[PDB]
Design a binder for these strands. Structure first.
Lengths: 737, 51, 49, 153
RNA sequence: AGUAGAAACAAGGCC
RNA sequence: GGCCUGCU
């Protein structure tokens, strides 16, 4: 209502009426930006020179009544002098800090919602886990990536339209949404903003920031997933590198993409390996992705891919079927077949023996960027339909089908040097060699296949040798189509054998996989590939001495757990913890020892407190002769590369982390044994083996005052509860004994 | 390498020739609105300065 | 903002439509509707001068 | 001018009242921005389906739009083009040719026949003036190119 | 004098 | 002396 009253008052005057009437809606932008003050050419100089003056800030007129003229001392906070070309009055930064320390309060509970992207970023960073740092050359290739972690797959204009419809329903204009996905996201947003008190402009800006997708050109090497590119400055260097696992939406898509690329790489490397089976097994057991081990995902996620299936079978777990050909996945759906072990000649007159199959049979081709369905007979193709995306995809599918047909029209087309021996001097599969030869270009296979008539049924399009559709005469048996997906996703995982050279086979005797099918494409992982291999323990690295020590105490846990309780002095003075002690610095051995022994002793004293991780962690430090002391520690240093790696008493670390899900212990990126569940594990929230003379009753409470620190706790006395901030910025309650 | 006196040699009439060759077989209005810029730059007067 | 209608005319049209829709289903009642409509009428009269 | 209930007084001239309650809300001749703003506002408040193209007027008692056109070509072709243009048409369509031929959808002419006669007289007088001038044939043969706009820089 | 370098500052406008 | 400016 007051809008029209203000409009009337404004138009009452002459100049205001003239500007109101003459100017049209289009000129509003020009009138808004109409200003005499030009932009700063050197903002830094002006800012440095302006803060020296009094009143270098401009604030709305409301300051006049919201903030006093002067603070307690008498320093002016605002001046009635007006700005150059506005009603804003001039104030000094004293005004800003006065507002911050005395200004009206408010409930900011909705602030995390409005800026949800930044708080989600902090959430990811807080829950992220680090690993060892590797010094090694980085091939910093430059490519385009996505910088928005949660882009909603919308163009800038489409995103603007969605924002305007969500926040400004009436101003949407002529635009009407079309895609059902847009409508779904619009409804999702509208439901959650049915009542929001913040200004519409802020909501619109937030939706624009968290919907529009952003792309920038960066020198990335490893990653490219929007979550990884966010922290690119922390996991990528000129010579150094680090493994980082963002603590966020471990989306199945990203995990499976990383798994697929890792499978491709491992298979490619195993192909050249002297003993591919053993090397593949050890490397699969000696690598992880995104902080999760390869075996866990492999046994968990079912994902169809030649390399992925190869890894699945290698472990001996349940293995898939539906044989593949030329990188495509074939599923028979009709008929029997028998090989014949026959002999023939080529067009280049080279003689060769092959195995041709019997019977009429239909097949369901599948692939990465194509799809097809085939019907054939003994040595003879019957029909072929294809569903590729691009024209070269259909060409690939067609040449693969022609090779699969084993027709003499293909045999009498082979021309040139096609030697069936590998780099390793291993005779190569004939089929893959033909299929690789016909992938440069299959011109001769096209002019030598044949021609037939067609009924012109369904209005189907004709075939193309070199992009020439022929709607009345065409290749024999071959058809043109474009389906959306193959017949159906197969339903059976089979058993198999493997030769030394990784030639997978089935129960009957047919061939199922081989190192020639591994597509070949060199993709980019989404999650960091923790390809632990050279990354090692030399002949005896910490991954050896240290990592191994923890492994020994894991394996002998059954008698250490009971020797730890009775006669423990004969466990500390043990011949297995001596290589470890050589790494602890000679000055802080006995201090650590007294600390840890007092920990374990008062952990034995009070009942209901037992954590196997603490005992497995702190024993190599109690080996040394005990020197007494009065202080306390948040970590324990061990010298690994003239560098002090700190092992945290309370909680996990990049050097020592026990996963609570898969129960594996992990030292330095190397597995060190599965850890077992003692039934006497006190699940009471109490931790008696973190502080020297103090327990940990639980989480913080605001009654006992602010958070004291580790090095200021001797002030307390008997029975004096208190709060302490320890660990990775975590406050807890403690109690003296 | 590096070109010397780059600005003092790009005659606007060459820009007009390029704009006319780019806009072959285009609506006359578009051709005119594109060609108007070099035509105005060919007759520019450079105001001297503060003095 | 796009459009070629003078600023006063756009403001008055928006006010009239807003009042209309509010009165049709909303808070605005007959008295306020009459007051706002007559204010808009006099604003238009002032414009036309 | 509608009233408390669904009826109108349809005065002749200069008969206002405190209960204005206008029966029609003109949409044509408001500018594209304002026209679309009002269309979206009324569609939101009522919850109807927004017409793809800009209508001419609106019906408040019945809550539907109305499209009105003037044609020099054959009336039936123009009417069917209007009908097929308005997808899933929930809006009444009305056509007024100069010669007097009239049409609509379902023949639901929700208007006083006196208004129809007045508009017919206005169109007939305009036709008389055009014929006296002699531009009527040019208007008849020039409607084809009116919809398209060519830049004339 | 001094800064500074192809032209300037070493205070300027108005009542 | 007073007002006004410290990229106009």
């Amino acid at each position: 209502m007051e809008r029209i009253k203000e409009l009337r008052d404004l138009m009452s005057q002459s100049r205001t009426r003239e500007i109101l009437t003459k100017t049209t809606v289009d000129h509003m932008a020009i009138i808004k930006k109409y200003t005499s003050g030009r932009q700063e050419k050197n903002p830094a100089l002006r800012m440095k020179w302006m803060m020296a003056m009094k009143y270098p800030i401009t604030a709305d007129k409301r300051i006049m009544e919201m903030i006093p003229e002067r603070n307690e001392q008498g320093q002016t906070l605002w001046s009635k002098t007006n700005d150059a070309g506005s009603d804003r009055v001039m104030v000094s930064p004293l005004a800003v800090t006065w507002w911050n320390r005395n200004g009206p309060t408010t409930s900011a509970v909705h602030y995390p919602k409005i800026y949800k992207t930044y708080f989600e970023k902090v959430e990811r960073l807080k829950h992220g886990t680090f690993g060892p740092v590797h010094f090694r050359n980085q091939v910093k290739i430059r490519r385009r990536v996505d910088i928005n972690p949660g882009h909603a797959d919308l163009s800038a204009k489409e995103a603007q339209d969605v924002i305007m419809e969500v926040v400004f329903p009436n101003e949407v204009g002529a635009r009407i949404l079309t895609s059902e996905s847009q409508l779904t996201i619009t409804k999702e947003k509208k439901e959650e903003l049915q009542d929001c008190k913040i200004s519409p402009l802020m909501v619109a800006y937030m939706l624009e920031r968290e919907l529009v997708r952003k792309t920038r050109f960066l020198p990335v090497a490893g990653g490219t997933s929007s979550v990884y590119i966010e922290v690119l400055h922390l996991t990528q260097g000129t010579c150094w590198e680090q493994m980082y696992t963002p603590g966020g939406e471990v989306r199945n898509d990203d995990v499976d993409q990383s798994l697929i690329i890792a499978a491709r790489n491992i298979v490619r490397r195993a192909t050249v390996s002297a003993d591919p089976l053993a090397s593949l097994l050890e490397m699969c057991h000696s690598t992880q992705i995104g902080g999760i081990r390869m075996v866990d995902i492999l046994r968990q996620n079912p994902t169809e891919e030649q390399a992925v299936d190869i890894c699945k079978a290698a472990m001996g777990l349940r293995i898939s079927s539906s044989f593949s050909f030329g990188g495509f996945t074939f599923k028979r759906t009709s008929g029997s077949s028998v090989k014949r072990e026959e002999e023939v000649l080529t067009g280049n007159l080279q003689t060769l023996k092959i195995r041709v199959h019997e019977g009429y049979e239909e097949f369901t081709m599948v692939g990465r960027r194509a799809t097809a369905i085939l019907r054939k007979a003994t040595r003879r193709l019957i029909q072929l339909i294809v569903s590729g995306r691009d024209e070269q995809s259909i060409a690939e599918a067609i040449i693969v089908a022609m090779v699969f047909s084993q027709e003499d029209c293909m045999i009498k087309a082979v021309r040139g040097d096609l030697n069936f021996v590998n780099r390793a001097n291993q005779r190569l599969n004939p089929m893959h060699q033909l299929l690789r030869h016909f992938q440069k270009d299959a011109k001769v296979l096209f002019q030598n296949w044949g021609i037939e008539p067609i009924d012109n049924v369904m209005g189907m399009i004709g075939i193309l040798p070199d992009m020439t559709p022929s709607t009345e005469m065409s290749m024999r048996g071959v058809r043109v189509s474009k389906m959306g997906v193959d017949e159906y996703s197969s339903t059976e995982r089979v058993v198999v054998s493997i030769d030394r050279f990784l030639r997978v086979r089935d129960q009957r005797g047919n061939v199922l996989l081989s190192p020639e099918e591994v597509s070949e494409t060199q993709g980019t992982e989404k999650l960091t590939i923790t390809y632990s291999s050279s990354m090692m323990w030399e002949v005896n690295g910490p991954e050896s001495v240290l990592v191994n020590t923890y492994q020994w105490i894991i394996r002998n846990w059954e008698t250490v757990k009971i020797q730890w309780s009775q006669n423990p002095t004969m466990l500390y003075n043990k011949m297995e913890f001596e290589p470890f002690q050589s790494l602890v610095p000679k000055a802080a051995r006995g201090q650590y020892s007294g600390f840890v022994r007092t920990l374990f002793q008062q952990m034995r004293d009070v009942l209901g407190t037992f954590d196997t991780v603490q005992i497995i962690k702190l024993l190599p430090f109690a080996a040394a002769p005990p020197k007494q002391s009065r202080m306390q520690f948040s970590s324990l240093t061990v010298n690994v590369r003239g560098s002090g790696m700190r092992i945290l008493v309370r909680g996990n670390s990049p050097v020592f982390n026990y996963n609570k899900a898969t129960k594996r212990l992990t030292v330095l990126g190397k597995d060190a044994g599965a850890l077992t569940e003692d039934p006497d594990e006190g699940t009471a929230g109490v931790e008696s083996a973190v502080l020297r003379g103090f327990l940990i009753l639980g989480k913080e409470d605001r009654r006992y005052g602010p958070a004291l620190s580790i090095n200021e706790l001797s002030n307390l006395a008997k029975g004096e509860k208190a709060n302490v901030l320890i660990g990775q910025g975590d406050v807890v309650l403690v109690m003296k004994r | 390498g590096d070109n010397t006196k780059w600005n003092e040699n790009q005659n606007p009439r060459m820009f007009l020739a390029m704009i006319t060759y780019i806009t072959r077989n285009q609506p006359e209005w578009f051709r005119n609105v594109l060609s108007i810029a070099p035509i105005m730059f060919s007759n520019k007067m450079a105001r001297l300065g503060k003095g | 903002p796009v459009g070629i209608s003078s600023m006063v005319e756009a403001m008055v049209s928006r006010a009239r439509i807003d009042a209309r829709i509010d009165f049709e289903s909303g808070r605005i009642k007959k008295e306020e509707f009459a007051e706002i409509m007559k204010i808009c009428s006099t604003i238009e009269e002032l414009r036309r001068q | 001018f509608i009233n408390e209930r669904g009826e109108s007084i349809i005065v002749e001239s200069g008969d206002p009242n405190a209960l204005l309650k206008h029966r029609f809300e003109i949409i044509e001749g408001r500018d594209r921005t304002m026209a679309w703003t009002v269309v979206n506002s009324i569609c939101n408040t009522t919850g109807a389906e927004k017409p793809k193209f800009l209508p001419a007027l609106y019906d408040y008692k019945e809550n539907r739009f109305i499209e009105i056109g003037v044609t020099r070509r054959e009336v039936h072709i123009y009417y069917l083009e209007k009908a097929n243009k308005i997808k899933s048409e929930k809006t009444h369509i009305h056509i007024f040719s100069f010669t007097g031929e009239e049409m609509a959808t379902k023949a639901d002419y929700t208007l006083d026949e006196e208004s129809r006669a007045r508009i017919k007289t206005r169109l007939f007088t305009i036709r008389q003036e055009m014929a006296s001038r002699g531009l009527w044939d040019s208007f008849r043969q020039s409607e084809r190119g009116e919809e398209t706009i060519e830049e004339r820089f």
